[PDB]
Design a protein around this nucleic acid. Structure first.
Lengths: 185, 122, 362
RNA sequence: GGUUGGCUUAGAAGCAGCCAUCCUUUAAAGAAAGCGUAAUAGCUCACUAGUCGAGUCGGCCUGCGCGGAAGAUGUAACGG
RNA sequence: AAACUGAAGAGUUUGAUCAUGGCUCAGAUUGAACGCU
RNA sequence: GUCUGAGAGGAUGAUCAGCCACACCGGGACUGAGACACGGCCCGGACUCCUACGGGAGGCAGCAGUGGGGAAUAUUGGACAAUG
């Protein structure tokens, strides 16, 4: 499918709202029906052009840094963090299960261990979001260097699916890594 | 040949009309600024409701001089005025239109924007 | 019990802390009675809900017996009430706090802690071409004036304050002429003697000093000072240096004192960064609370108005998000109780995304 | 080895500080002379046994020396 | 034959009163907006 | 004309019809029965865009529509079948 994390949101008079990023999957073309899934509720739009360096492009496919116009949608209803997905490809979620590996002191991380109730920052693609870690029942501590399956409760929905990698920081200092093994509801 | 307390026209649309050189930068006892040289200016005359106002202290680059700029063949190139283009804190141009010609001494990295926006380049 | 050294030790149950936003001038203080009534209303309702009505009634009648004679024309910025089943202590503070009610084992004293942590004790050196004065000042009040009747000037090897400039050129004798233009040199040497007296007095107390005077006098003194690193402020727009009283001088240096406090809060950011680099800074509320309770934290950095309620139990050392009405107040109490320091950083210097930080001991 | 002596202290585990300097296996080992830790940990020391083999150790006084010791026309503080 | 059909007051100054006199309201209307539906 | 008013008056000049004026701004005219010409010309100007830097181009107050401003006002539709 097609997915593009929204990096920059601006507008051109007459052309509309342009949301630039880097296409991570699929292709985008003039007339493609797309959706904005992420921080807020899903908004369904259509593509009305792709350009780069103030020059119209034939089509934007996975890999390049193309920008895309959205039909009708205004420039305060899209922000950095959501993704332009293909309708139904991905879903906005706020609760999931991960394969979190806590960093050790040698690689950075911390001395202190992860514990249930900890609310670090979660960096999904191009957005950070606070999320409470809930260790799986039968565990109250996760020492640095280990790797366990915890459940994350984000404060607001983030579009994701099983397979997506992310990093866990506590101030710009990386304190862990993870991969979503299952999205919940 | 621009020194401290010399007045310059503004070759751009930052809002300024006349600036006064209050420092030639780039050396302890540095005397003159030619084309391409960075100067500290005070704005003496600004356009109403512009980006800069009268009394700002900022950076500028000299873009044309009455004394002239020499060329490798020995030719000189003189202008009817001394003109400057205002810069920001990082010595980068702050304008989107350039008035009058400039010279090729501005060719490089920082003032390439001035060169591309100039009506004519000598 | 009107002090912080008594509120933290009176451990009653229920301990009720009520904060009312009051006003110093009229008619802004016209709504102070209504604010007090509303706060006591919520106090009564919460006390009845959480405890029994009898224990709510005794507390509220005790508060009313003390607030019935309150004069709202003499209100400061905040009115704090510390009520128990047996005692009620109400104090007026020049600190601004958000109106709230805290019912817990201990009295909510984080505002008193912030007021005491903002304390600045300093010297004021008042210079003039004719004289020098020295004042000791705490925050915004004069401690002492350093006149003839003082203990700190009893055993002095230098000229005691107030120091008159009785130079040979000032009296017109001694072996100097006005056509020699030695006046600037004379002023420099007089200010050097003034700094000698200042250093002699400072060695016994060691507080920062503020230089007050004309710009030129301050200049000469700064060039002549033996310990110019202890200078924290210079004010040159203060009036009546020779006749005005010490309270007037301290009133005039308050802007510079506040700027100094701001500079200290700016400097605290560098130490926070050093701890973050050394991996000794906790910013999550849970981790901060656990470290504070087990006595691992040496410095706390709150964002000056970061109130937060949570579910805190001191058995598993857990802090779940909402209960205790001031989890940050509990963290401050634990940090102070375990011999730590609390710094209440300004909002424009500490981000609201991370409003609490703790530099730990390990 | 009792033992992280007791107290104090967030912590005070030989080693922040305050109050004793005890006992045990001993050839010997201080409730420790230092480094170290947030505190423990850890590295030494005192002390003992072994190796080697002859003089060795530290205070006291005294004489003459060394450092402490930077200036302006030129060596320039034995007249040379 | 017709175009010839239309006109309401109240409250509020005073201890009460009459007058004066302002303010306010009940009506009609809209290229309407907003809120609930 | 519209609203209001018993009326006289008062307020107002969307939609429909008549008249006038204007067509990014300033100026000049040409062609023509008619224009100093909304989707014509020339010169100048501001702005926007293309350029190989020498030079060029453009004007929704037409109908849809966009950005913006705003408390707030619609479709980037069909057909010339009817009246012109």
């Amino acid at each position: 499918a097609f997915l593009m994390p929204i990096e920059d949101v601006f507008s051109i008079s007459g052309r509309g709202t342009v949301v630039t990023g880097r296409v991570e999957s699929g292709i985008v073309k003039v007339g493609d029906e797309i959706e904005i899934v992420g921080i807020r509720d899903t908004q369904k739009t259509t593509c009305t052009g792709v350009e780069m360096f103030r020059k119209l492009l034939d089509e934007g496919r996975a890999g390049e840094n193309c920008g895309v116009l959205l039909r009708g949608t205004k420039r305060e209803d899209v922000q950095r963090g959501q993704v332009l997905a293909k309708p139904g490809s991905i879903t906005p979620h706020t609760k999931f299960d991960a394969e979190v590996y806590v960093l050790s002191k040698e690689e950075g991380g911390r001395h202190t261990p992860f514990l249930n109730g900890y609310r670090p920052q979660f960096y999904f693609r191009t957005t950070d979001v606070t999320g409470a870690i809930q260790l799986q029942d039968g565990t109250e501590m996760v020492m640095p260097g280990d790797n366990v399956e915890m459940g994350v409760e984000l404060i607001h929905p983030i579009a994701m699916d099983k397979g997506l990698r992310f990093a866990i920081r506590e101030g710009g200092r990386t304190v862990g890594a993870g991969v979503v093994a299952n999205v919940n509801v | 040949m621009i020194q401290v307390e010399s007045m310059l026209e503004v070759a751009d649309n930052s809002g300024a009309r006349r600036v006064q050189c209050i420092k030639v930068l780039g050396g302890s006892h540095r005397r003159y600024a030619s084309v391409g040289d960075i100067i500290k200016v005070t704005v003496k005359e600004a356009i109403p409701r512009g980006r800069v106002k009268k009394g700002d202290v900022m950076n500028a680059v000299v873009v044309r001089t009455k004394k002239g700029v020499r060329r490798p063949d020995g030719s000189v190139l003189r202008f009817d005025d001394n003109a400057a283009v205002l810069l920001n804190q990082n010595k980068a141009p702050i304008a989107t239109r350039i008035f009058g010609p400039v010279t090729r001494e501005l060719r490089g990295d920082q003032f390439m924007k001035i060169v591309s926006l100039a009506p004519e380049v000598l | 019990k009107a002090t912080l050294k008594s509120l933290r030790e009176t451990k009653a149950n229920p301990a009720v802390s009520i904060f009312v936003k009051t006003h110093r001038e009229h008619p802004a203080n016209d709504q102070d009675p209504i604010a007090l009534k509303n706060q006591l209303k919520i106090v009564e309702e919460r006390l009845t809900n959480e405890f029994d009505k009898r224990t709510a009634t005794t507390i509220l009648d005790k508060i009313h017996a003390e607030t019935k004679e309150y004069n709202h024309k003499y209100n400061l910025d905040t009115l704090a009430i510390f009520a128990s089943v047996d005692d009620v202590q109400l104090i007026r503070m020049p600190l601004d706090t958000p109106e709230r009610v805290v019912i817990s084992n201990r009295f909510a004293t984080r505002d008193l802690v912030r007021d005491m942590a903002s304390a600045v004790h300093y010297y004021t050196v008042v210079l003039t071409r004719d004289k020098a004065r020295l004042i000791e000042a705490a925050n915004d009040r004069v401690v002492a004036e350093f006149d003839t009747d003082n203990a700190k000037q009893n055993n002095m090897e230098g000229i005691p304050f107030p120091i008159d400039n009785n130079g040979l050129y000032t009296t017109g004798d001694g072996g100097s002429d006005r056509s020699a233009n030695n006046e600037n040199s004379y002023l420099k040497e007089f200010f050097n003697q003034v700094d000698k007296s200042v250093q002699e007095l400072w060695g016994e107390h060691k507080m920062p000093l503020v230089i007050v005077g004309d710009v030129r006098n301050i200049s000469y003194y700064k060039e002549v000072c033996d310990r110019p690193e202890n200078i924290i402020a210079t004010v040159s727009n203060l009036t009546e240096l020779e006749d005005g009283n010490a309270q007037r001088i301290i009133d005039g240096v308050q802007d510079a004192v506040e700027g100094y406090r701001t500079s200290l809060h700016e400097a605290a950011l560098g130490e926070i960064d050093k701890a973050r680099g050394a991996n000794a800074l906790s910013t999550d509320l849970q981790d901060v609370y656990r470290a504070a309770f087990q006595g691992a934290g040496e410095t706390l950095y709150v964002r000056r108005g970061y109130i937060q309620a949570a579910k805190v139990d001191e058995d598993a050392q857990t802090l779940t998000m909402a209960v205790t009405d001031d989890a940050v107040g509990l963290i401050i109490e634990h940090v102070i109780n375990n011999g730590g320091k609390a710094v209440f950083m300004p909002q424009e210097m500490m981000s609201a995304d991370q409003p609490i930080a703790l530099v730990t001991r390990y």
